[PDB]
Design a binder for this molecule. Structure first.
Ligand SMILES: [Mn+2]
Ligand SMILES: [Mn+2]
Lengths: 208, 210
């Protein structure tokens, strides 16, 4: 079918203690796997099966109406997670961006420290399941969030927000409950340790 | 302030193995506590602080607009969880209802087994955080679900569904991840073991009053 589960760029325990191996394993091999399987089933009937996922989710307006929900959720699931594994890494940096990106950040947010707050807040104040994102939007950076597996690539009409994600954090409870339980903020603070800013800079460039 | 955290009807470990003690504890003393605290902060400015929570959530259309979301989420949170603790119990029944309620269930769903499937599916197919409910609606029972801390008492306009809940299961991942991780269906199947059907009957009776 269209989609398969990407292999991770690192081992299930590469991100310890920030994220636990068990969680990485379940998250990847079950949660992501299902988004993939279920998207594949949706794409069954359709003209859309050979599209790149990140293209597919920009065309939910074009797909069969009675598939739209299923694809939004599961194609969304797949796109969101495929990104997430790639913007994390072992042994990064204290870790921060530099270059064109650090400059972008400074202009849009004031500083990296300021950006980190604005990001953590979008993430904290996201109620129920969702994601928080750093997007490029008209060449300028902004921070935003989405419900469930919604992505800014799906446009304002569908996701409530818009822009191109270059960084995202899963704040579905499955992403952090085993290690941090209710302590979402503890999870968010640990996150910064494992961001791969090389990859995020990589995408700043593209998205420009 | 308006609200406080209710005490549970049973010990944190009363529902083992179906739900683990640690989860009950965090679920009650953190998750619910926050819904209570946050609701109290919202109610601060307002004419609505002395309402019963289950009345308050039926008047979100009446409250200040800029408080509406905070209250839907947090008063919702508080109402949902206050109910949830009360419809579970230790050492129930194989556990099932009887009386006026078993009849009601038979007429609306065909049988208890059938009802359990309809309920398990509403719960399973609920995407992201939310709840599954057994509601009374025009005297007839139905099964429905809601996003996040939405409750059918908020009406169709806000919750997407309507009716009076007499049973609900939390399918926020916080409710089951420690014990079941991704296995929501395993969680749902265990739940039937700790339903208190006496309390659910009790509500059927009340909710029948128009
Ligand atoms: Mn996830
Ligand atoms: Mn809960």
């Amino acid at each position: 079918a269209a989609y398969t589960l990407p292999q991770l760029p690192y081992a299930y325990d590469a991100l310890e203690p920030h994220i636990d191996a068990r969680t990485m394993e379940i998250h990847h091999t079950k949660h992501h796997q299902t988004y993939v399987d279920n998207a594949n089933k949706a794409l069954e009937g359709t003209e859309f099966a050979d599209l790149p996922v990140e293209q597919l989710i920009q065309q939910l307006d074009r797909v069969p109406a009675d598939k739209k929900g299923a694809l939004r959720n599961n194609a969304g699931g797949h796109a969101n997670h495929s990104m997430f594994w790639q913007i994390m890494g072992q042994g990064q940096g204290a870790n921060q961006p530099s270059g064109e990106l650090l400059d972008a950040i400074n202009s849009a947010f004031g500083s990296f420290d300021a950006f980190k707050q604005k990001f953590e807040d979008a993430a904290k104040t996201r109620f129920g399941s969702g994601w928080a994102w750093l997007v490029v939007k008209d060449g300028k950076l902004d921070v935003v969030s989405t419900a469930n597996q919604d992505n800014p690539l799906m446009g304002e009409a569908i996701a409530g927000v818009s822009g191109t994600p270059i960084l995202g954090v899963d704040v579905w409870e499955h992403a952090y409950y085993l290690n941090y339980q209710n302590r979402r903020p503890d999870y968010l603070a640990a996150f910064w340790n494992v961001v791969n800013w090389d990859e995020v800079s990589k995408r700043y460039a593209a998205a420009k």
